[PDB]
Design a binder for these strands. Sequence first.
DNA 1: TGAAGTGGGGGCCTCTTGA
DNA 2: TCAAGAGGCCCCCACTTCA
Lengths: 57, 58
Amino acid sequence: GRRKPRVLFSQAQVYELERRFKQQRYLSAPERDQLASVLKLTSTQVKIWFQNRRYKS
Amino acid sequence: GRRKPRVLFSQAQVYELERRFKQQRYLSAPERDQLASVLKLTSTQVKIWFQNRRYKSK
DNA sequence: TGAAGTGGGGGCCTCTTGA
DNA sequence: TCAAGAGGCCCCCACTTCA
Ligand SMILES: [Mg+2]
């Protein structure tokens, strides 16, 4: 049936995620929530981005 | 069918567990493994004892 | 009695998918 | 492409269960 499409993170969102990754490979529960607010993404999305980022690297 | 029995912890083991609990309500994996080794219990039993002790503390 | 089971949070890691 | 699915394994709290 119809399903929700994956939406790519913008250049700005990716830049900030990367900028933060350069300072911390792992984020605590509070930090994820905060960054998710700054990026306008969900806590989970930030959590998974870091997870895939640690894996990719 | 027959299933493994629940074995109680000795007075000495519980005494040491209650001693550590008065020092820390929670333990890290290294702390849980070192205590398990000392008491002759697995790390899961220790983990589960602190979990239960906390619930009962409520 | 009281350690252990059930089940519902989250989490990290690892590999793979497919609009 | 690349965020997300999903198996494998961990810690926590609530609330029982029954040798
Ligand atoms: Mg796409």
